[PDB]
């Protein structure tokens, strides 16, 4: 059922969401909850 349109939908969905994604953009390590803060 028009697989090109559907994979283009997957593409535009992810490229819409790629920027605010905290793993492909990455972390600034100060907004990271997984800074360790231990000794």
């Amino acid at each position: 059922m028009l697989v090109s349109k559907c994979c283009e939908e997957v593409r535009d969905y992810v490229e819409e969401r790629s920027g605010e994604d905290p793993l492909v953009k990455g972390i600034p390590e100060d907004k990271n909850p997984f800074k360790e803060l231990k000794g």
Partner: protein, 311 residues
Amino acid sequence: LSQITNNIDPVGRIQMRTRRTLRGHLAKIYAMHWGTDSRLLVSASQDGKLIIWDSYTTNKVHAIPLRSSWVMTCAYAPSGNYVACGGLDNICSIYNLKTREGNVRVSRELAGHTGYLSCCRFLDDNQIVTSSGDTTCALWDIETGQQTTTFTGHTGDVMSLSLAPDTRLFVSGACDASAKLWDVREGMCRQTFTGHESDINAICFFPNGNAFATGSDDATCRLFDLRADQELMTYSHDNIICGITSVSFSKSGRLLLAGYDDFNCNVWDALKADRAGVLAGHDNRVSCLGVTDDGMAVATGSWDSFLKIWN
């Protein structure tokens, strides 16, 4: 898909460090599900325990002693009130986190099955879908104890299951190499997907809820579309031949995390079908991995009894 989606610039090399490490288990871990608050995660293993960790402080907020040690799956309800677990005992036992007593107890034992339970997912606090060992899937209602809608129609036994984000429907995979898109409300299958050589071991929805990837014993992840009713992409690479035990997407969908039996997890660019990164933490089969709904952390459990949390 790679001929279309190659104009987008690549993600670059992904380097992630083990931001936490959740020790305590004495066997192979088989499952892990985040919470919808993205802080608690449950993780079950063959030593009779499932343990509700706090991912930030590495604290064990709970540890539930199970009646039969053989446990293939677990799920964490989106309220945070319930957990579930089932294995070779054919019983998807259900535990109540938020009790007045504060002691987790088996609210009900869901039974009436002639096979091991491959997977459980929570719809609501009163609806739970499972994936059995008699080649069928089901949907239980916990308050009655009766299975509401039994899903019959596979020939080889079913191996995974993945609810959609809006939980109106779900996808289950089996040894037929046929992923089927069931429907919760009506009660019949809608679409059947072939395209794998052998058995499929891992299914995860794309975050929009309009697609899903599928990890198999054929060293091939294959992302399918539900509307277009056919295979869309074949995430596979040469020099690797081992099986896949778990898959999960990122929050945006840009990177999919595949769990191989070369003892380490690989990170696939979901658009160019490139191995974008290697997560080389574990020293045995990576049996389960999962990404937070907030998209910040990725925890991965394995048969060396170590949950690592990468970021």
